[PDB]
């Protein structure tokens, strides 16, 4: 039994009314507030949510979710941890609950970040996606999570073992001292997972989100440049992904990297020396200041 | 040659705007458009500016009838159909076409004197895309169908199907009803495009121009929201969820804000190739809330 | 321009209701229809009201045959051509088409003597799925196909291919047969839709209107349980199961309750692109029961 | 309007019987079909009862080109085309016909003296499948394409060309040669269908009325047995393997019994939508025998 | 009848040839062919010996514009268009058409005084395929599609849609814009095969006859690697890369060695089938370097 | 876990001149050179190369590249052979980064060729393959490697036995003493391998490469012949492959063979006595003087 898509993240928050303005208002997620004090949720498809926020006065990752099947295939799992001997906790119903989940096992990572595991999300087909501003199409997510994020891992090689245990698989993608960052896939989506990128001063680097239609995302872009925020790496293309992408700051002073035309992982291990176009560094400083084309 | 290829846009006489809003929108799932004009507003269901435009003016009835042509030499050769039938009309300026949001106009009447525009070239907002008034499963069929279909006012049966002849619209009697003194109701239907029908008439007397307007929702999801939506407002149903044997489309008919119908539907099937009538309709249809001029029974 | 677009329906007397129901429905698969008309009943095979009306009137051939046209602008186009070439015919009035249960038509008569009759927009029982009078496989191929096709009686073969080259269909001779006497049998076959052929004609003396019709399953296995029963019930076979090399469809032809054949077969592929002829048939089609006109070798 | 549809047969007169069937059928796969006729046999590539018709009359050349036309309006149509433009004709009578195996005929003569013959209903023996002369990997084309092509002599380009548009061949010229002289040459090729050409000519002086045939077959590897067995039999090759850039086809060309040549081919593309030229071919047809009238440098 | 099929070809004037090697085929991936011509070279993108025609005369602007017919008889009806509507014409000779490397031309000019040609039977140079003067992903879009798009001088907007009508293009009015003075700037843009636009005009004073041309790509990824050279070599870019809301496709604009504008493209949809118009981009196309006759604000 | 293409061939070549004119000058192939004073590549598609030439001065194959999907599958085949007992060196990064892949396994066949297995090849996807001559079309390489080789093996049963061990699958294809050769596939390609072809001088018979389009072939046949280069076999087809293609002498005196349109290998086993059509033998003394029709 494996993982099979990276289903939700927990971020700790300073500003909830930044993150609406952003998350909503540019890049077109949907605001869901069930009326909880210190929390709101980002919805991107039927999903009752696939991001939330805790207004706790943090600007970092909160919590990684990766989904399985279902309850034989979570105790699967389990039961690898076990053998393996990696400490992890069967969590309550109310705790499953509380994450809108069936079913959950809390642990980490080697790096130390927090990792859950879980079956049967809450699903609100009966309440339809409706954008935070006008969408030409929808987000990727079918059968591939909400998209893929680069994480931090001071043990690149035990961060590797860790997750083809959850069923991740992947090596290293490129040759960049050699920075030789890890790619991870569980499903369509070219990654779900990267690490090995350098120092990080944030357990996050970005999260990448992808649009089903072009014009979505020279939207987003747009506005981005509209709203004077911050880019670091103009639009371009990854030789790996071969996705149209960007990276751009958000309230919490790391990235989000919008994009569309994401490829597959191929069938077998490749490995690229360079970016195919764009990504030109523009604004230095969010743990991106490398020549990706040289 | 050149015929009318979809019903583009309506032109409604309205008494109240914010009911308006509240069900086109908030319902229906359409998107309210408001450029700042002070006695109009417009109703958006795709790419296009607008297929609704709402005046303020008290009324509560249609205004005007717009027929789309493919482009400027279709309407010309349209127009010399007109001409040489004897048909009056009137050729717009760019102004009165910038109006209407086209790049050309033709403004006339057909003979049950329902006010009638042939036109190309419509705005398309595709900058600003499509955002519905309440949340949708899917979207509207409009893509080379027009807004939907539309019942009319004709005093003149034969009259009326031989105007829309000439405009391109294909079509005849449907449906065949007994009446209550031996007489036959016999409704004719007409359609220019893949949408079964964009046009009848012939439903016998009529207190306004428009008796309905027919929308199409892409997904079955959005007809149960909006069926759904209207039932718990208490809004009037005058024909219950079912299908009638020409389109084969799944609607209800419900008042609207201006005292006539909307009909929400889902699935109608392309106009048969070649002529067919019935006798009845297939399921539903139930007549519910009466007086609003299809007090008829269907089945 | 306008042309007939297939073969819409066939009027029969008959002498005997009782024995048709009995073979029409429980062998052959259509359906029986009573309107409670005192003098006639209908065989259904499809959406349609009817396909095949049996009047009860004591004689034991065709009455007449109906080709459909798309609309009533077709129609007229096709009288006028009616009317150009010096051929009478009769416009029906409402009560005439409703007694056809058809929205319009014409009736007039080929050069053979045959009642023909040109009509649109037939009434489509949608809410009344077709039950077949026996269990069934699958359905009948009608669809923009017409029920099936005949073989009538021309005296003047060309004549009559003139006359319904006017009405639209296409097609000339595809066999050729060696006669008695060193002369050669050449009979007719036209289309008017993807059917192989709906007519043929030029098959040398007959002493009924109508030679055969032929009718077609969709599934294999209809025809396989039509074949048996026939068999069982001893009913006479002309020729058995085999293949023309015209249509290659599988059928065998057998007697009826008014001693004329039908020809229930499976498989017909369309008409040919260009004309074509043959000699002879593909395989079976053997002789067996004689006297039903079709006493010619076919190998 | 109408047009002829495809090449359908070729009369050949030959001088040995015995050659061409050890070479048409043994080598190349065609069937041979003898009918017991004193002075011919027949070639068959597929349904048809023949593509080609041998007359041992002694003389080794062309005899006659059959194109196909749709049916016998079409052919009416066409011989009126010809009698518009004063050109004369022959109607052939019922037994002309049956002789070509056609349902209808007209006899006449191209510009450059050919005899050309058009006709509709061609005689198809299904009921004898095609059984080839030499075991095949697969069929030839010809469905909807007729036999292949034929280059063929024209004193006059420019009157042939015009003659075959009448016709209803499209084309022009494809290539441009250079010539020892500082003249051009520019061989003109025309299609009816989805073959890249039936026709071609203006390739200069020919001793023949014909200069090749080509024959397409579905697989390559009855190209390649085909070409296996001319070079075991020492039959001139005049052509090698190779690509023309106008059909992009797969093809040899090589000697027949007559002293003209076949060209044997495979993977023919269909003609381009919209005329193209080209100065030279693709690959290969490297010069090999000389004196068969291509002598000339292809690349 | 008969309509230009697709823009074929553009013959420019030139001051710098070497500049112009390094550009179009360096940076955009065309393949440079020189025939050994004292005073011109050609820049080919696909399978046509070429699209554009370099003359180095000095001038820097737009030579002559060729439109494709299908074939000679294509040619002629539009030449008889020509004369009717008391167009001056010039019917080229064969040595002007084997200058052009076309079959047959006619040479005129639009009202523009835009030399305009129409020509058949391209040479195609099959035998030594595409290769691009830089390392291409994909190949460019131009299949019955034609080399791309323009933009041109019109100091009559009405009589150049008049005149390309009858050429056989069609299109009208797709986008308003607000000028200083209250007017609005309306241009026309025109097709004749499946790219959005061939042809486009009524943009403005223009010092040049040409204010640019649009080519496209197959592969996004040649655009991209295009436009990081462009930006490497320090080339002026008027509009960044964005949409129009027209044709959809992902583009940017500029500057070529004669001071005029090319806007490398991808993924262009084809026009609508119906006349559609708006009043701004979809995204991006950021006004940035100034003075190339496009610095409207798109959005 | 098994091998999945045969993935690149090292060659010791003579002249790298002659190699440049024949192999991209005719075939069509692109010549990389990174500096290196003592080889230079040959590319066919996306993967920096799939050709290695040695300027060595020698004339026959170095080396043999097998492919596997990563890092898992490529631990697993070293342990089986390690179970079989076969000899192997795991290389260093540097041995790795050499042959432009993450991870390397090197090793001999039974008849003493040097093979290796890999994982992660190089991919250029920034620079387009491009052509050292005008190309219609491609090369055929996605998911089927570079083509197929013919090598020497004086125990055609062991060689059998050890590339089965590899992943590969096939076995005697032809009966023509009786000469009996084998035929081995991994992929979608015919067959990647094959082996007991009588005597051979070499390690390496021949290399075939195959075209996407007809018409590439039609221009490599042409050249061959305008140039005088010797051709063994002449245009044909065998019945196992049923591709077009024809076997002419390269720079190093052995064997290319170009060809087009070669068919998946059966499901199912089967064997055959002769070629289907062409393949007529001409400039004898390349080791393919057989008749292979009758
Ligand atoms: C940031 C980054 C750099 C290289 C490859 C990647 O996939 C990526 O996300
Ligand atoms: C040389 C050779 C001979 C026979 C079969 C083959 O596949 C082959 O490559
Ligand atoms: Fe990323
Ligand atoms: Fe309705
Ligand atoms: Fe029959
Ligand atoms: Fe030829
Ligand atoms: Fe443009
Ligand atoms: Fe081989």
Redesign the pocket.
Known sequence: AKVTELGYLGLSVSNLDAWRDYAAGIMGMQVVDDGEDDRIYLRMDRWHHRIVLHADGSDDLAYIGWRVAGPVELDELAEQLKNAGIPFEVASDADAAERRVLGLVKLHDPGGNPTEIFYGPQVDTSSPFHPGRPMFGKFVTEGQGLGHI?IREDDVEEATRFYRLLGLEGAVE?KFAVGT?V?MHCNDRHHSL?FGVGPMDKRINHLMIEYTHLDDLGYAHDLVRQQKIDVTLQIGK?S??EALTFYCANPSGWLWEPGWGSRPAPAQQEHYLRDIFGHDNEVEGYG?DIP?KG
Chains 1, 6 share one sequence.
């Open positions: 680069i490129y960052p790619f990267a990854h790996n992904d991106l990706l």
